[PDB]
């Protein structure tokens with residue numbers, strides 16, 4: 001409901017961008033004095049079509065309903081007269097994404113497990129509100145302080161229909177395939193369990209400290225190869241169906257790797273839910289925090 005008046009918005013730097021969206025940091029100063037609040041502003045590119053324009057409206061609506069300690073804070077909207085859509089004004093998360101953060105900050109296993117737990121809390125919340133995320137990756141997890149993590153982007157989030165257990169996707173070129181379960185790649189259906197597979201990939205990223213050479217696209221493309229034309233996805237699907245998985249990250253405990261493998265069961269019904277993961281991670285965290 002909060003309206004941001006464009007006249008007090010001053011652009012500081014870009015925070016990120018995608019094919020149809022862009023996030024920039026702004027100081028919102030209705031005085032030009034020392035009370036200026038830092039905000040993250042997501043805008044939809046003016047050249048986006050009706051599909052993305054309606055998806056944007058839906059994305060804005062999704063963030064307005066969402067309220068949880070491990071979900072980025074919705075702040076308000078304002079008129080993007082330049083793009084004739086609204087702008088999503090959210091809180092500014094200071095330390096960035098774990099993808100930006102982890103390669104430069106040697107973080108302990110215990111803090112990593114705490115992040116993992118917090119991601120599950122935020123996700124079990126999203127799923128209780130009958131929404132699937134569809135883009136759960138370390139790049140979408142913002143670090144507030146060394147003990148507070150938040151899911152900070154919902155560009156692909158969708159409402160799970162009333163009499164349904166999954167959503168029909170209709171796959172595109174922007175689809176994060178290396179974070180996707182077999183049922184997503186193959187049957188074009190995204191379940192609540194499909195987000196759990198993606199969490200297993202995010203957990204692998206956390207345990208590799210988001211090292212680019214150890215990344216899911218890097219490791220999967222090494223296994224599939226690159227002379228494989230129009231068949232990266234088919235070859236990814238079949239390696240997953242043969243039981244092939246991302247390797248065990250160096251210094252990752254065997255029990256935690258087992259948990260990652262359990263999130264990556266080929267059979268979606270065999271995967272734990274996020275509500276199931278919370279007591280398990282709470283307990284594995286305490287264990288390594290000692």
Ligand SMILES: C[C@@H]1[C@@H]2CN(c3nc(Nc4cnn(C)c4)ncc3F)C[C@]12NC(=O)[C@@H]1CC1(F)F
Pocket residue numbers: 015016017018020021022023040072090091092093094095096097100139140141142152153155
């Ligand atoms: C979580 C992922 C990125 C980064 N975002 C945010 N980043 C921050 N803090 C921060 C501090 N340094 N850095 C680099 C980033 N605070 C709030 C944010 F909302 C939102 C976002 N989504 C996007 O960027 C999508 C891709 C697009 F459409 F722009």
